Amino acid sequence: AQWVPRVDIKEEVNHFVLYADLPGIDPSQIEVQMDKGILSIRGERKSESSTETERFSRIERRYGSFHRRFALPDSADADGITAAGRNGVLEIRIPKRPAA
Amino acid sequence: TAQWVPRVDIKEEVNHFVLYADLPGIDPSQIEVQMDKGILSIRGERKSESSTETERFSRIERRYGSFHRRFALPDSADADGITAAGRNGVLEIRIPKRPA
């Protein structure tokens, strides 16, 4: 089961903010990149369930690699991205470029 | 308490159970974990930024709200031994099995 971590994306006055539910991963293990106007998050989650699988009486948490990409408007400035994580939410801030 | 249904894996080891609950974006201390008459519950309420200035969101995929996960654990689960500790959004609940 491909892990597709859920993301909300918001456009604020000076930023886009992407919030990504990435439970079970240290924020430092999530690869955030943005190239060509497309914000990418990529990483891998191990799950306790792939060890002693037969001991689990229920398994549904998704894990494994994920890689999601989000085209953002041209206003998004790839070079200013910051990301901080807490309680497995990675919150990525993408500043907007000043208007042309 | 069940606007969303957090993913939980449950494992029964030789001498303990472990539940792993993906509860991204909630402090572990806001998450109530108890057993009552065999039933392990995990409940609490996740808030989400997407409820604030919702119209500024171009995507909202993250589920939140109250949850109340219940599992009818075997009688061997020592209701008095539960610990629950979260890291990066994953709550790990450990319950030793009864001697008898």
Q: How far apart are CA A66 and CA A22, in angstroms?
A: 10
Sheet holding B65-72, edge to edge: B32-36, B39-46, B65-72
Task: List chain A residues with CB under 8 Å of B8.
Answer: 58, 60-61
* Residue numbers of B between 26 and 55 with CB closer than 8 Å to A: 26-28, 48-50, 53
Please report which residue ranges of chain A form alpha helices under DSSP H. Answer: none
Helix (H, G, I), strand (E, B) or coil at B71: strand
For residues B95 and B84, what is the distance between their CA atoms, to the nearest angstrom?
9
**Contact status, residue B10 vs residue A58, Cβ threshold 8 Å:** yes
> What architecture does CATH give domain B1-100?
Sandwich (2.60)
Which of B14, B87, B90 to probe by mutation at the A interface, max A CB count within 10 Å?
Answer: B90
Residues of A in contact with B71 (CB under 8 A): 58
In chain A, after which residues is the C-to-N distance over 2.5 Å, breaking the chain?
none
- Name the structure determination technique: X-ray
Our measurement of the distance from residue B41's CA atom to the centroid of its chain's CA atoms, rounded to an integer in Å, reads: 7
Nearest CA in chain B to A51: B11
Which residues from B are below 8 Å from A50, CB to CB?
A: none
The alpha carbons of chain B give a radius of gyration, in whole angstroms, of: 15
